[PDB]
Amino acid sequence: SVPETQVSILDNGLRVASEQSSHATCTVGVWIDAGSRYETEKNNGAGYFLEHLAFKGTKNRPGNALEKEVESIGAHLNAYSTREHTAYLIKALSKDLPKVVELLADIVQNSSLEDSQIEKERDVILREMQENDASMQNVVFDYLHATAFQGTPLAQAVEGPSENVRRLSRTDLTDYLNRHYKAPRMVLAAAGGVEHQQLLDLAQKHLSSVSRVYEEDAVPGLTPCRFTGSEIRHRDDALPLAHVAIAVEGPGWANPDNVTLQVANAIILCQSFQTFNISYSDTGLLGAHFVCDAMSIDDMVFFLQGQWMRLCTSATESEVTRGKNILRNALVSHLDGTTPVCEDIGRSLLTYGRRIPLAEWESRIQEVDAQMLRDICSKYFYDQCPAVAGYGPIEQLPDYNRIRSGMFWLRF
Amino acid sequence: TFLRWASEPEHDHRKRMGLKMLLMMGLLLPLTYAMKRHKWSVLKSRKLAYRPP
C-alpha cells in the first residue's frame, strides 16, 4: 500500500522523479553524480568549495538574496557532498512548491561565484580543515579510504588537500560546475505532499536548458578502483582514546548480496563498535569502526575478527532471523520522514537508475537464509587482505601479519 | 680401502643420506626464505612519516 515512486526524464536528461504522501512538508532536492571521485587531484576541493559557495550568491539572487527568500517562506536549505554524489535539498511547505523549485534551479545553474565570496569561503574551509582534524572518526575513515584506495581518485577526500583549497580559481570552479553538472547526471527528487504532474511542469520551466554538452567532447569517464590492503597508523599518544577502522572490499551498489551483507552487519567491548558497509560504485568497504582505550584495541580486534569468522563458518538461523528483523526496520519510508525519503529517491535514481520499492527489499530480505549468508561472508571476509586505519595511542594495535592471519581460522 | 671400510662400515650409507640432505636443503632453504621475506616484506615496505601538527 506504499505509493510508488514515479520517474520521468526530461530532454536535458535530468530525471525529475517524485513521490507523494499525505504529508505537506515536501523536501525537494537535486542530486548530482559528482563527487571527489570525479576530481583529478588538481581540483580536489572543487565540489566542497562550490558547495560552500553555491548557497552564498547566485546571479539572479545577488549576495544573500537567496537565503532571504528561503527565510521568507520559513524553508530549510541544506547541502552535502560525498565521494560520489552531491545533494542540494530544501524542506518546505507544500503550497510553496513552485518557488522552491525555482530556487533550486538557480542553485544548479545561473549560480554566481563572487570572487570575494570565493575568498571568504577559502577562510572558512581552510580553518575548518584546520580544526576538522579534531574529529577523530572522520580522520580514521579518511585514512582508511586513503590506504584502501591508494593511487586512485577514491583515496582523496571530499575536502581535498589544503593546497587545492588555497588555490582555486573562479575558472576552475566554473569548470567543475560546467563539467560535472550535466543534465543527464541529475535527479530532481521530491517527497511528501507534492503532485508529480505539477513538479514535472515546474521542472521544465525552471530546470530546462540544464547543460548537457561537454567541452570539446571532454566527456568524463571512470576508473574501476583497486582495493589495496594496507594499513595506516597515525600514532599520537596524547589523545585519550583510539579509533580503529578495519574494512574489506565491498561489492558495489548494483550487486544484490549487499542486502545479505547488511544482514551480516545486523548480526554484529571497546566503547563504540559500529559495523559499516560503505558502498561506492563498483567497490565498497565492509568493516568496523571501534574506538577503544589503548590497552584493549588488541582484544577488540580479536573479538571483531572472531565475530566475522563465526559469520563465515557457524551462522545459525536464529541470528539470521534477528538480523533480517533488524534490517527490515531500517527501511526508509514516509514515517522516516520526507527528507529521508527524499534522499533515497535521489540516491536510487543516481545509483540503481530506478527507485527500488520496499516490497522488493522485503523479498530480497526474506530470500536470505543462513547458508547463503555464510557463503557470501566467506566470499567477502574470509582470507581477505583488509585496510586498517588507526589514530591515537595505537601501539598495542597489532600489525598487518596478526590481523590478516587472524582472518583465517586454522580450524576453518 | 678395506681398512677404511672397516673403520667406517657406513661410509656408503651416509653419503646417500648427505645427497638426500643436500637436495632437501636446496628445496627448502629458498622456500623458507620466501616465507620469511613475505612475512617481513610488510615491515620492509613500511613508510614512516613525521607530521608534527
Side-chain angles (χ1 to χ4, degrees):
Chain A
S1 69
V2 170
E4 69 275 16
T5 296
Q6 39 191 344
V7 188
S8 53
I9 176 164
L10 291 179
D11 289 345
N12 289 284
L14 174 161
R15 298 182 286 273
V16 182
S18 81
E19 171 62 22
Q20 187 162 12
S21 62
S22 60
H23 310 76
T25 300
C26 55
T27 306
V28 193
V30 178
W31 272 262
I32 313 155
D33 221 345
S36 81
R37 185 191 188 96
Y38 299 94
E39 296 159 353
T40 180
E41 190 276 331
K42 293 187 286 185
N43 48 349
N44 207 2
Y48 199 55
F49 183 76
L50 269 177
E51 189 276 331
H52 268 61
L53 272 170
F55 288 153
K56 338 298 172 55
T58 70
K59 280 186 286 293
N60 291 181
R61 284 65 188 267
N64 63 352
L66 197 162
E67 74 190 19
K68 178 184 179 60
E69 292 203 17
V70 175
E71 295 293 329
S72 63
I73 56 178
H76 287 272
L77 180 48
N78 202 12
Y80 62 83
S81 183
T82 70
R83 284 178 167 83
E84 275 186 341
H85 315 117
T86 313
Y88 303 92
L89 73 164
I90 297 169
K91 310 165 60 65
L93 300 190
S94 287
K95 58 179 185 62
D96 292 314
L97 178 60
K99 163 159 279 302
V100 168
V101 172
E102 183 178 1
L103 281 171
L104 272 187
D106 291 331
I107 296 173
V108 300
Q109 55 186 355
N110 308 0
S111 178
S112 67
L113 312 176
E114 322 299 339
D115 298 11
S116 63
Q117 207 69 28
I118 283 179
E119 292 297 346
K120 291 179 286 294
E121 288 296 340
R122 176 163 292 94
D123 301 336
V124 183
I125 296 190
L126 278 168
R127 64 175 304 276
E128 59 186 356
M129 289 188 312
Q130 292 171 175
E131 62 203 356
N132 282 346
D133 50 359
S135 181
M136 300 187 66
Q137 65 182 357
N138 300 328
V139 176
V140 170
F141 270 93
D142 278 340
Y143 283 178
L144 185 75
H145 272 92
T147 198
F149 298 120
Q150 306 171 356
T152 74
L154 212 51
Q156 46 199 3
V158 179
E159 277 68 16
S162 306
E163 296 71 17
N164 286 38
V165 171
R166 305 185 185 93
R167 172 212 47 87
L168 285 181
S169 61
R170 197 193 202 278
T171 58
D172 191 359
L173 310 173
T174 300
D175 168 30
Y176 189 93
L177 185 60
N178 298 4
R179 163 172 175 84
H180 308 93
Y181 271 42
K182 292 305 182 198
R185 291 201 261 106
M186 265 155 77
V187 183
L188 178 71
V194 293
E195 191 191 3
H196 184 66
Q197 195 42 250
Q198 181 191 354
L199 181 87
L200 181 54
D201 304 343
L202 293 167
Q204 193 61 16
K205 166 178 179 57
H206 312 269
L207 254 180
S208 188
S209 298
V210 172
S211 74
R212 177 183 54 181
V213 180
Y214 299 97
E215 311 169 355
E216 56 183 344
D217 289 345
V219 178
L222 224 47
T223 191
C225 321
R226 65 191 185 189
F227 185 72
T228 68
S230 308
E231 174 191 28
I232 167 167
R233 305 171 60 101
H234 191 174
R235 192 165 169 188
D236 192 6
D237 269 332
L239 299 159
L241 287 171
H243 298 227
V244 173
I246 300 165
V248 293
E249 190 168 0
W253 279 113
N255 196 358
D257 48 15
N258 275 287
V259 178
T260 308
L261 289 177
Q262 282 167 3
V263 180
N265 286 338
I267 295 178
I268 308 151
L269 180 45
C270 276
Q271 279 58 22
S272 170
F273 158 52
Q274 47 176 357
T275 54
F276 64 76
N277 180 6
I278 303 185
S279 307
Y280 297 112
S281 182
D282 289 345
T283 189
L285 310 187
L286 189 45
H289 172 255
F290 55 86
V291 178
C292 186
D293 51 347
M295 303 304 300
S296 307
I297 299 184
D298 187 2
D299 306 344
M300 190 72 180
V301 168
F302 171 82
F303 158 83
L304 168 59
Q305 292 209 350
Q307 288 291 10
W308 287 346
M309 303 293 93
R310 193 181 60 88
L311 289 192
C312 294
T313 42
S314 313
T316 74
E317 301 284 340
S318 48
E319 44 180 344
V320 162
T321 312
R322 185 181 92 235
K324 281 151 80 169
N325 291 327
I326 288 161
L327 197 59
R328 282 198 181 101
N329 292 356
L331 295 174
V332 292
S333 183
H334 51 278
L335 294 52
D336 197 349
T338 57
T339 286
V341 170
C342 186
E343 205 285 343
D344 179 24
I345 305 180
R347 277 194 290 110
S348 312
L349 271 296
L350 281 189
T351 54
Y352 310 122
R354 64 182 181 98
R355 174 91 199 276
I356 299 179
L358 282 165
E360 181 177 338
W361 288 121
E362 190 276 331
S363 162
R364 291 170 187 278
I365 279 169
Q366 65 182 357
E367 66 183 1
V368 166
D369 75 302
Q371 177 61 40
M372 88 160 67
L373 187 153
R374 58 179 160 251
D375 277 353
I376 284 154
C377 280
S378 293
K379 190 197 184 307
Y380 285 107
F381 271 122
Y382 195 81
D383 210 5
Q384 302 294 324
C385 285
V388 190
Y391 187 32
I394 48 167
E395 164 185 272
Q396 184 177 1
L397 162 79
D399 56 357
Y400 205 87
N401 285 304
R402 308 299 297 271
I403 299 183
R404 178 68 171 87
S405 296
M407 298 293 299
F408 75 91
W409 277 11
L410 290 167
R411 65 177 168 270
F412 176 74
Chain B
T1 314
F2 164 73
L3 292 177
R4 169 62 190 275
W5 168 83
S7 300
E8 190 176 12
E10 66 281 2
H11 173 275
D12 289 16
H13 178 43
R14 171 173 53 92
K15 298 292 180 65
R16 170 182 278 139
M17 275 183 180
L19 169 67
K20 290 192 176 183
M21 183 278 288
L22 294 175
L23 290 171
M24 274 305 296
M25 290 291 183
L27 188 153
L28 272 185
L29 283 161
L31 289 172
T32 318
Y33 192 39
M35 290 180 48
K36 189 265 181 184
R37 282 195 70 113
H38 189 80
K39 292 274 184 183
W40 260 71
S41 64
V42 175
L43 290 184
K44 292 186 180 304
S45 54
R46 174 187 59 187
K47 298 180 174 300
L48 305 180
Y50 185 48
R51 301 290 299 179

